[PDB]
Every structure is written in structure tokens, then in C-alpha cells.
Amino acid sequence: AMRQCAIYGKGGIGKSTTTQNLVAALAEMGKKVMIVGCDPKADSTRLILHSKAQNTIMEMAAEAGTVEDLELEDVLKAGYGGVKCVESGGPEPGVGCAGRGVITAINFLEEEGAYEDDLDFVFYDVLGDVVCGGFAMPIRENKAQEIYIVCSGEMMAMYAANNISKGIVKYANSGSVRLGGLICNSRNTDREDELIIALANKLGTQMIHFVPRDNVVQRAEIRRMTVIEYDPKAKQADEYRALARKVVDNKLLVIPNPITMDELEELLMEFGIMEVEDESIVGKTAEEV
Amino acid sequence: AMRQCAIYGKGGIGKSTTTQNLVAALAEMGKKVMIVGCDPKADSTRLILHSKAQNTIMEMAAEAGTVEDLELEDVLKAGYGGVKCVESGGPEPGVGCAGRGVITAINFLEEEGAYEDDLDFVFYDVLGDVVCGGFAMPIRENKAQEIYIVCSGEMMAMYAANNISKGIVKYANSGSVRLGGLICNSRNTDREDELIIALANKLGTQMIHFVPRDNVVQRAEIRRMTVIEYDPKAKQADEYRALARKVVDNKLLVIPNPITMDELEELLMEFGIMEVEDESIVGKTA
Amino acid sequence: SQQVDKIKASYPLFLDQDYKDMLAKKRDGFEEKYPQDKIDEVFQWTTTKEYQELNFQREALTVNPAKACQPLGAVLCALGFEKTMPYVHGSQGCVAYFRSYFNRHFREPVSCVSDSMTEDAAVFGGQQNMKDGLQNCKATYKPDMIAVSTTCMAEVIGDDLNAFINNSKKEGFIPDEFPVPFAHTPSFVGSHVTGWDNMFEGIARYFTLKSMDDKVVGSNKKINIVPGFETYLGNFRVIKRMLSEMGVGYSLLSDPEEVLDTPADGQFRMYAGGTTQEEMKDAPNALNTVLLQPWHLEKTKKFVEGTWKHEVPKLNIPMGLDWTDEFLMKVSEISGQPIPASLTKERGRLVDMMTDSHTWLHGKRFALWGDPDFVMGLVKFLLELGCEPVHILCHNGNKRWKKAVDAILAASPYGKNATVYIGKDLWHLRSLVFTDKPDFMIGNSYGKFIQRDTLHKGKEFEVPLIRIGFPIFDRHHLHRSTTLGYEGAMQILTTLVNSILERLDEETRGMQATDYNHDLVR
Ligand code: SF4
């Protein structure tokens, strides 16, 4: 009855925001949700609690002993729409696997059963940059079932969406993990919405929704709140709600069909993003050629 | 004489490029240098070796059985001005610590003894987005000593830097992996440059240089090559050649004094980068 | 060799030179054993703090557990009912160990059967093994009631106990009014205590679910008492005794205190006393229902409060001075009977004892383990005595419990160095006793080894085991002991202080060395 979703994607592209607003809109509908930050940056809840930076498990844990030294009381907080959120905790510089900090945060929640609790949804905000075994954690332990990738028109951003798909498959066979779809964050690029859907198909999935770039958003952030708790009547507001509906009834939980760096390139250059390689001028000075 | 270096930085600011161009200067300046690509994207040698994408030890070992199947020319390839370039190799998508593939890579460079061969410098191009065990490996094993950070005048770019320092602070009480300053890549930000040195010292080191942004680069790269080889006459080529020496000569190799998150929230509003913190504005809103 | 006059058994037979030189060859010759010096190396290693860290990181491996499966408790529970025959619907091999296990702990005959399901049933369940089974059993050991439980298999292939039972009645294998309660008991869920919970619940239903109409809380002036999974006869008794001494009308639900102590008079009884069925049927009419070992009777409290509509109190297992008070009181409150001078005195005496020998118990570090209620009650009591329960382990416990305990620990100066662990096993405890060494271990026989180990490292490191719990095999008749109530408190208090003094004697018995502190009067 409780669906476990996780949002993956490259960093610095409003992913955490979209996610949080998604949950926000998801809250209005009446769905009890829970977010679990797995982004080393630790900032996946700020927009719900208004706080500048929630206390990560790994922090309070090193201020008590091991782990079960503390209690969900000061680790799990209820913000707007009664949403419950906890941030895993950034790995210790130089020493420590980010993934590690995640499991321990999950298992902890498992132990004090922060799950069994009428939750309809639980979103694991996960950074999907260098898709390693660390960040793949929530999928390996099989705690995440529905995967929604966040990206936009950009090589690296898409290059991530791809490698993440690769990852999903690596387990999708011996597991139930699936790729619900893609979410494109408007980066005000021409034919951006087109480029993603195209790519989605190559993977065998679909672009669940296209989040435009309204500025009412940057207003809420500054306010530390979500587009919803800020202006429940803005345009961008009903935009996310559209994503909420879509997710609630998605059916495309599939196993992506990864593509080659070349297949990928082919698209970019084709949508006007990437250039076209001039195999000849390669290694030619402004003098000889 | 062989000073093993490392260039860390938030992926997406020029690190990879500025790193190629930094060495591109040394070999041309009569310096035997080997670039070890530790970035997962695997584009740490493309500009040197004039290649579209060099083959990583993984795409080969994983191919031809294992590691005991590879040779030296296979991965290690001397590009511009006799510069041996190797790509650590990305992690097996969804599995394996990306930093585990680097150990296997640096260790293998010692199996075919690719260091002892008349070389002046070693350059590790490690990704410093999240300083986890993976990318922090080259430092842990003391395989690098000279740590120069690439960090533009941008929120995250600088944060990563601060954190990389902390990565050093940890292995400093056992290894000779010291600091080496910052390398700010222009981005047209007012005071961006000072903003850097304003922080370099806050750590205990300096801003070894302020690389500007000339189209000669976006043109030199288009031609899978460095700005050095392209047009040594263009003033931008000097920016690179200048720093080149600054590095060799650089005597300051300290131990960072990692500031706090709030100390950064401060240093960034001091230069109008980060918006000033309001107050009654937060919370509830109609 | 043997001197017909003084025969030597396994020990010390093999200490004879020939046997010595015998095994020596076998070793060097074909064992290819690691040079001693290595074994000594590795060993020493395990007694370190480093090994601990590595040990506590275990996830998939479990070494020397401290819990058993559900059925084991379903069986025991079922034994508490008049002419009831524990029936475990599943592979027969299981029942084997069950009886076999209890026998070693009670040194009494454990009667229990199995409908011997096999491979040929891993596809079509055992709708037949049930039919024939129930019939065979009923006609052979002619019980008045048959309680059905399940084994690992049974649940994995998933069989509907209810259905199967309903058909065995329909198809005429056993009368239709023949009591055959049931409960699913998956091995892979909770410990044995959970079995009991289930089982009991399963019986409660069978006699009160389809007939709550003519029932009216308080109509009988009695209090129901559910003992839970109890293995110390003396307990069942002390409860009955205290209540009867209080003039309280009670109905002990699930009383195996008789079949577990049938006398040796020339004839074997497979059944003896126990909770009558009528007692169960009527239970609902009881003023209230008290749970002796709540921490593992939640599925019962639910049903009890939910159906019978009783206001089950928030009571702790009655162990130690404090809690037992609370128990007696709450009992009074309910029954309306004053606490008799008799008990007021027993108590007073328990206190006398405490004062009489605190000096020795004070500041004594213990490491202990067992079941939830038991463990926490033991912890509570040690605190009332002034000891420091440093390693409270409990393999089958949960988080909610761990908290309640920490709460108990935090409320006492003597709980500063106390640590509670759940999910951990005896191999973990093994380390906790090497690194952060206590003075004794209070637990079951499985702990006899941990002792051996502590000694292998050295006399000054040995930690004497104090048998209190379940199961106990290397000692006799301890199952007749008592841990509940004031009677219990006393026993434990003695088993303790004396265990302590027992050892202090051993440490100062050295002639002209330490025998100076070998005082006569202590
Ligand atoms: S799995 Fe990823 S985050 Fe975890 S240690 Fe390896 S590289 Fe660092």
C-alpha cells in the first residue's frame, strides 16, 4: 500500500526543489508522505521545515555514540502538510561511503518503524551524479521501488539519466526496481521538452512531466518554503500538482534500455544542443588550417 | 623530483580543461609529465592525446579478462610533448566504488613501473564533487602530495573546495599530502577573483592563479587540443604558461584550516554572491 | 586401561598417557592443524576490542543465537490445557527437537505430535496429513483437545490451518465439536515467545469469539492470569500461592505446572491438570485480565481488550521488590482484597535480606541475557540491589522494548554504564565480556562456554556464569526454582550474593598467598 519512490539525477539542477514541491503538492491531495535525503549536500528538507539545514543522522549520531543512541524524536521532523523528513548525512570527508550513511539512516527508520505509519509515499532524494555503489544503495537494499529521474537539456545532465538507467537495470532483473519515468526541469532551452521525450523513448520510458521555470519558485526558496505553501494559486503551483497526479497513477514501471554515448550524442547535436564534429580540423593549428 | 599532484574541483567549471592546459605548458616547457585521469567522465586526457575519449583501464581489463591481460601502451599513451596519459576508469555503473577503480589503476601503473621512467611530475585529475572514500583514495594512499583545488566564484564550486581541504586535514597527520592553493576559473563575477583569495587565506594558503575565460579555449577544445598548442601567441596561452611556473616554484604546501558552513555563508554575502539573509520573510506567507 | 575397582569414564580416561600419545599421533599425522602458536595468536585476537568492532558489523551471520522458533512456544503453551495434545502441523523432524529440547530442561516427559508432512506434500500442501493426522492422534492418545501449530515448511508452502481443520471435521475425520484451536507460527518471525502469544490467542478465540453475547465483565469475581512463556515451575506456583493467600479468585490461563512435574509412582500420565476448557470459555466474565509477561503478549492484550473488553493494566513482570509491589497493589485495586499481613511480612523479610547483604552485591558488574520481560525484570532487580547491569543483551527483543529498559536504567544511579543490545547474539556478548569485563554472567547454559573462553585467556579474566533462565542442561532441577514475586526475589538474591562469595573464596584459598582474606565470617 505504501509506494517507495526515489528521485535520482545530477546535482545543481533544482532536483531537490522539484522533489520537495512534488511532495508538497502530493501533500495537499491528502497523501501522507516522508522524504529521506540521500544527497551528500544535505538540503533535501529545508523547503518543508523552513529550516536552513536539518540535523543529519550522522551528525546527531556522533553526538550520542553509535546510532540507536538517539531517537527519531530529534531526527525525524514534521513540516508542512505533516510531511516527515530526515536527511541521511554527508559522508566524512576523505573517509566514508555516502551510501553507508544512507543505509544506516534507512535501517534506523526501519527499526523505529518510521515506515509502518499510514505512509502512502516515501521519497528518497538521491543524488545520481557518479552513480556508484554508494548512491545506488537505496536500490540495492531494495528499499526503493519506483525510480523517477530528474534532468534537463544538457549533456552531463542527460549523461547522468543514462548511467542511472544503466544502474537500475543491473538490479531490475534480480529485483523489482523499475524506471517510472523522467522529469525535465526547464532550463529555458529551445526544444528542451522535445529532447527529453525523445530520449525517454530510446530508454523505453516516458517523461512523466515537464517542470517549467517560473520565478515564483525562487521566491518560495528565499522564503524557505515550497511553491505550494507559498502561493497555493500560482501557475507553477498547478504545474507540480500535475506531476503529483501523474505519479500517483503511473503504470510505466519498466526496465530501461540504455543507449550508447554515441546514440546519445546523435540526439544532442540533432536537437541543436551539441555541435557536429569536424574530424579533419582535429589537431590543426589556426595557421596550418 | 617527481612531485605527484592532484587537481580537485566541482565537476563543471573548467577543471578538466584548465588541468590539461596547465600540463600542456610543462611538457612544452621541457617537463616530463604524466596525467592520470581520476574523473568518472573520463575526459582528463582528451586534449593532450588529441583523442575523443581515451580507453579507461576498465573498458579494457573488463574486456580482455582482467588486469593481468593489459600492457602499458594499452592504457598509458604519451600525447602532446611526451605526456603519458591514463584514465582511472568510471565505476561499474550502479556498483563498485569509483575510487576503487583508481587504486587498481595507480597500482597497475607501478606493476609496469611507469613512474621511474625519467619523469618530473604526476598529475591526478580527481573529481571533487563529494569527497567520499572513492575520490579521497589518491590522497589516503599518499599517491599524490601537491593538492591544487579548482574552484570558481560559485556557491557549490567553493564548498567542494572547503570539503576537499577537510579531506586533506584528515590524512595530514600521517602523510605529506599538503595543500597548494586555489585555481579560480573566470566566470565574469565581480570580485570573483578576490573572493577566492579572500578564502584561500581563510584556509591557510593562496590563489595560485586566476585563469580568465577566452574564446580561444572554446575554440582550442573544439579542435580536441589545448590553447597552448593552438595559438601560443594568444594572450590566454600566457595565463596558462604563467601558472605553470608558479606551480613548479610554489613552495607553500600547507595544511588547510577548513572554515565552517556559516563562515562561508558570510564570505559569500561579503561579495554580493549570496543574497543577504532576511528573516520575518520566511515561514508562513499569504 | 581400567582398574575394575576404580573405573574411569570419558574423563579422566583420555588423560592416560597412552590416550595422550594416541591422540598426539593422530593430530600431527593427519589433522594438518595450524601450529599451536597460531591458534594462540588468533584466539588472543578475538578477545580484543578490534575484533569486537568487526564482530558487531555482522549482518548476515549469526553465531550462537539466544532464541528458538515460534512453535517451541506454541507447544509449551498448549501443554497448559487439560488433556490437550500439542500438534505441530509440519515436518516431523521439528517435533523431535521440541520434545527433545524441553526434556533436557525439565527432565520430564514432553508429549507432542506431528502429522509428518513430507516432500510429496510440498506441492499440494497436507490437506490429507491433517485429515488422517487429527484422526490418528485423537484415537491414539485420546486427548480432550488438540491445539494445532505449524512448522517452517507448513507456512512457506502456505496451508490454511483453519480450512484444513474445518474439512477434517466435515469429511468426518474427527467430531465437529471436538476442540481443535489453531494458530500459525512461522519460524522466521519473532522468537519462540511469539509462538506462545499466537497459540494462546488462537485458543482464546476458539472459545470466546463466537459467543460474546452472554458474557458480562466482572460476573465471576475472578482475575485471569496469563503466564506467557514460563519455564520455571516455581513461578506458576508462587503466583497461585500469593493470590490464594490474598483471597483473590483467579483463573490461570495456560497452566503446565502439573504435566511438567508428574510424580514417579509407577504409572505414566501424559496429561495432568491444566486449564480446563470451561475456564477459558468463562474467562471473559473475569473482572479483568493481567499479563505477567506483557512484552510478548501484545497479540493477546489486543484480543483481550478488543473482544473480552477488559482493561488490561500496564504492569511489568513481577520481579524484584518494586514491581511485585505494584503487582500486588493493582491486584488489590481490582479484586478489592487488602494486602494480607502475610505478604506484608514476606516483603519485609526480602528487604531484611537485601540489607543483610548489600555490602557484597554493591557495585557488582553483571552481563546478562534472556527474554524481554525476564531480562528487564532481572535488570530492574539488580538495580534495586545496587549492582551495575553493564551488558543487557536480548536477542529476541525489539526497539520499543530497548527504550523502556533504557528508561529504567536512566532512572537509577546504578545504570550509568548500562548498555542494552537487541538483535545481537552470544558471540557478540562474548566480546563485550572480554573488552568491558563484568564480574558474572546471568544467563542460560549456552553461556557455559563464554566462561570457558574467558578462562582460556586467564584466571583473572574468567567470568563465572550464574545459571538463571532457559534452557538449563548442565545442572539439575533448577527448573523448580522461582523468579517471580518476593519468593523469587529471595532466591535470586541468594543465588547471587552466594555466587559472589562462592568465588571470593576460590580466589583466596591459595595457601600462604591469598588465603589471608579467607575469612570464616563474611
Ligand atoms: S561507493 Fe561511491 S560514495 Fe561510496 S565510497 Fe565508493 S565512490 Fe565514495
Ligand SMILES: [Ca+2]
Ligand atoms: Ca523428571
